[PDB]
Symmetry: D2
């Protein structure tokens, strides 16, 4: 794990950061009471001045207390003297816990969103750089028709922009806390305190909560994270295919190294991390069916999944940004790979042209097949066989024949497509 | 499976419905060409009049062809005579396949959305009916504080309304087809044909496609379906708990039956179907990383998951609607269950009241604990013990003591919460 | 789905086959009571002669009964006259259901196991056929060191022989039924009736059951099935890579076709079916935690998973067997692919030889790197560059150089490895 | 995570313990070469005396090397002087990595297995302690028929004894390393060195490896781990249900506490940890299909799963053992809960007795239903209503009636079932 904790994301998930979120919540709540005239003026400022985050103290108290937030509430109690009457007043532990996890997931979502937007900018730049670079399109791993390498990157760009909007909605979904007390009905803490306290944190009130924020929001967020990761996985698998020794179209950045031993190690790592990101979706979905007004089975799951899902995805986005930013792209090898089958890429164009000139689907098909076959089993090109085919010679001119091998045919609509992403 | 195929949803997924979607696509495409002046006037109308869906013919041709859409294209070919020149013109098979699955998933999404909205109306009605019905709030399966049964149903209502908006976005995500030919670059079919043909189907053009519509859209849709199902699972588990013999607060509708043998069979079934819905998420997510401009590994997955996920969820929503619509709710038993622990539900109120009147947290706590203990181990009530406690007798009046047992305390903010959902 | 239902597996999962298993269970149970003297002599043969599988009757009765096994018990009841006193006597529904599913899963396991052993025989045959066929070993998709193609097939053989054993244990695990009545404590049917009835069916008694056979047995079985599928998935991904245009070492069987358009469609299908097989594992694992002496949430999951997992794996085994049996293996291409990097595959042998002859690891490495580079960026071979390197010329003879390019170094232990599988 | 790392399991997964396993592998390999006469006598002891685990050195070298095992090989190299010629000789990195992970998973398996056997001993003890404790059996959460509480614990015992055996096979499955070099064909290190080196470590040779030990072995192991976890999850959900306020039959150990606020927090935790354990299964299964002779996508997954799955299960086994060892069992409450429905638990015996005495199934059923109804809606017992029923009065004696309410009918075979586990 520590392998991919990267700053800013990993600073979110220390024990200090967590206790500071709990204090933030507690201070928003005393502030809300005080602004409503419900506790004396001055309480919040004094608790702000005297409450310190002391991790060892809270952990020592927790040894005796066996309860994380009660230990915190007493630890803070021992620094704030008389003001402890007004601290954690009416709250249940999950008011603090779940509001603090909204804070963390919203912030993690924002870090993720900024790095994602940055991945989009790099993908847009790389797609425009190779906008007109010819490459062979491949279906079932088999040469199909010519295309451009910028258009392939644009498909990745297109997918990551759908993920920017998805990530914005997942941030919205998790932007809800609760300050509603034991079973969520404001018996011990007024709903006006909740509304003020959460607006100071940048959060909204869960419209109806139980003891807990409903876990379908978290499952939505984490399902969105797994889908972002699988798009990065699609990119990573492409580059693994393109860096294989028989292809050599692209090379992921590295580190003088042996030219024949450049392994796509980073993209293999990305593929494995995507497997982990989708692994967290299932446990988040059966966190949803909590018993009544809550059970705590989700808590242990979330200790793994919140920190690991958001730190792994962050590492995936930053790493894949660097891979696409700095990968070597071998344009001449791309172009050369179009001629690997020696013209047989243009074999549909040749087939149709024989139907145009009179022949029936089957008639044309047999002429192309025989030429294909000879091309495939030898060293001469498809075109050179077609030109010498007598049946072809009485139906098609030679200038007609040669123009069917123009790559620009496959390429006439690339700008049309790029233009859909402009402006 | 056939157990839960219900009309309208199951009519979507027959072989006839599929072939009709393929014809719909094909007709939108000839229409687009003809409206653009690219094929003669009259072609579409004549293909519309002569193309019949003949499932046995297509399947017989497929025996020879070994390819589903080629067999279809030839079957239709044999009915439409000369017009077959202009039919399926420039298309790749996945233009038809994936555009037809957008049609199916958008329509399935709309059927699902209407039944979901209807579930929301029933939940809103049931929540307002029991708005002020007292029930005991339960955390860790343990009596916590009083609450209202309408507020519990409102939490379900709140969750299903978040799922209506989620379902709308999932319908949007899947509203994209492609008419872009072999590797998605319009080499064989102009992008103006795509744009016209898909607007007649109510769909949008994938802004950049490969041979296929990118599979992250389908994974998003199906992840949303699994989250809707897990909310239905939360409801179903609640009712199972509430129909157990020691609780008897709610009874799912059934079918004169034995009163002691009413089993929550439907809600158990709902819980199992939610397990299947979340099971489809993982295969949809590794459908995303297709090789290059496509591989066909996703096709076999989607033969299971599109029809099964959308028919299971539809059955879940209709069944859970009926369960909530017609379930028996035992209000007097709910109210009686509040007094099961004989007043000990109000034990925090009693504790705080002793701190108010001078005592320290620990001092108060020991008085409540001893009374709790005596109450727990006997048949007299908490209140009756408190009244006779001397330490309590010198700190608290008896009218003070009795008012701490008012249920209306737990209940002062129920209308505030319901009002968040009005208007 | 129907796409891959293949005889004999799909005959297991009809409604008829299910009711036949129910009767088989019922007849074993009457036989057991009769042999113990608990019901009159002759009952079992009479019920055997009279009791007919009438699917439409049972479904008509179920319309009114709303209970599948009750409807069956009554339908059989209407055919067997006075002997209905002795039929289904003391049983709970899940005595019949779960015992019938053990029969099905055992027999499914056996059909799976015989096709698997047959897949092993084909793998052994193909591996021995290419025992000594040179091929380039590939790590990270990059040419590593020479090996044999039979050795690669052997690793697949070794994996499926581990699965044969795993399948035999999974059969063992599911060989347990129950005839123990409502909560599994033999209050209504004697344990000696259970023991006799299940030994007639070839099954063992769950040593302690509740109302149900414990679902960890089924989860273990389905987990083993998903493991077998992923080994098929490893094989199918190798053939996809090897059939790509730039590689052409292997070609899956098909159907005269275009030589350049041979797509690995069956293998991509096998990949997608492997994803469904692993998807069924999670739902099976959470069927395990049934509430108390049972809930029925697992029933609905098992209507999908039992038939779908066994039929999909059966399809995968039979199809992969035909793929490996009939695939074309291009040996000259495999041998030719070793020289793609023009000798650089032997570059570690060259490096070590320079350390042998005095040089330090870094010294040797720089000579190899420079020659590698020159080879990589040109058309001359590594050897030709080494021979002309003066630093190399004074440390190594030419005959010492050339013999580092012998493939038989890489193959000396092929024969030791096959030997481990013999006898 | 650190929450549940417990000695001895967490000592397995430090960086130090990992480098120690790497050295252990390296020393087995030098020992094997030396015993075969291939390197001078004395090398192994010298490398043993000199080779120190220096985590910070290896990490500093790795900063420059960017390769974990290379950095290790060099760091050891700087301590062992001239013997570095003989160290790591012919090995590929994954000879050390995968052999070291077999050591770890074997030893983890053994720690797991000893705590599991200990969980079985506690279960056997608790089951025998309540062998004859009457309790109500529950199906669909609804009172069914009386049984014994020891019988329920026996079913848990039976499940964990099946897991002991499953754990022994999973240990066997992962007992394979490799010392076969870059593509697993012993080109660079002899197979007799592998055989000797692995028998010193207690391991067997993968019969054919590629660059890596095949990942179906690890997926089988982790699948067995998730099965063991779900059986713990079945137990923990039972204790949650039994500790609910309306039931009070059992109370998990804790920490004087409030008697009404005893929450089943450990059991809810065990439930959530079971969800993480099953989440690791899917990522392990798709690690299986590595490309060719390996890709490294699995490495990153295994950095999470190996340590997390073995430590979480270890925590679950030890904690569930303490739960079952120390939980309070309320026998009088269990016995009292049988009479909750005031005799209606014996209603099938009454029904059958009326058919015995002449009546038809429907006739008998209506008498029982009417009395059931009256019992259900009042405070008088079923028996008292039956005795006063005139139709009952003319078919059944009072002593014939009362003895249908004997609990020993339900318990006669408890003793036969425990006997199956003896000896």
């Amino acid at each position: 794990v520590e392998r991919y904790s990267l700053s800013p994301m990993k600073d979110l998930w220390t024990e200090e950061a967590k206790y500071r979120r709990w204090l933030e919540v507690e201070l928003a709540v005393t502030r809300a009471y005080e602004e409503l005239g419900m506790i004396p003026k001055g309480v919040t400022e004094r608790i702000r001045n005297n409450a310190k985050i002391d991790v060892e103290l809270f952990k020592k108290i927790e040894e005796k207390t066996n309860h994380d937030v009660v230990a915190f509430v007493e630890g803070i109690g021992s620094m704030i003297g008389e003001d402890s009457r007004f601290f954690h007043y009416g709250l249940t532990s999950s008011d603090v816990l779940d509001t603090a996890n909204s804070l963390a997931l919203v912030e993690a979502g924002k870090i993720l969103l900024e790095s994602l937007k940055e991945f989009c900018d790099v993908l847009w730049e790389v797609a425009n750089r190779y906008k007109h670079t010819p490459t062979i399109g491949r279906t079932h791993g088999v040469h199909a028709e010519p295309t451009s390498f910028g258009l392939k990157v644009l498909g990745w760009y297109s997918e990551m922009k759908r993920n920017v909007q998805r990530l914005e909605r997942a941030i919205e979904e998790v932007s809800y806390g609760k300050i509603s007390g034991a079973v969520g009905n404001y018996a011990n803490v007024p709903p006006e305190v909740e509304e003020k306290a959460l607006s100071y944190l940048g959060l909204k009130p869960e419209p109806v909560s139980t003891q807990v924020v409903p876990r379908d929001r978290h499952a939505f967020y984490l399902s969105t994270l797994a889908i972002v990761a699988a798009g990065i996985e699609r990119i990573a698998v492409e580059i693994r295919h393109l860096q294989r020794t028989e292809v050599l179209e692209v090379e992921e950045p590295f580190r003088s190294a042996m030219p024949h031993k450049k392994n796509p190690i980073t993209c293999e790592r990305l593929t494995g991390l995507s497997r982990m990101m989708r692994a967290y979706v299932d446990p988040s979905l059966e966190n949803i069916a909590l018993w009544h007004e809550r059970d705590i089975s989700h808590s242990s799951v979330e200790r793994y999944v919140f920190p690991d899902a958001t730190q792994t995805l962050y590492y995936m986005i930053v790493t894949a940004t660097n891979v696409v930013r700095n990968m070597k792209v071998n344009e001449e090898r791309m172009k050369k790979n179009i001629d690997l089958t020696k013209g047989l890429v243009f074999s549909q164009r040749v087939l149709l042209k024989l139907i145009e000139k009179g022949l029936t689907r089957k008639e044309a098909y047999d002429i192309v097949q025989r030429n294909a076959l000879k091309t495939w089993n030898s060293e001469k090109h498809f075109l050179e066989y077609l030109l010498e085919d007598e049946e072809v010679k009485k139906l098609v001119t030679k200038e007609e024949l040669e123009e069917l091998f123009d790559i620009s045919y496959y390429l006439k609509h690339v700008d049309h497509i790029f233009e859909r992403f402009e402006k």
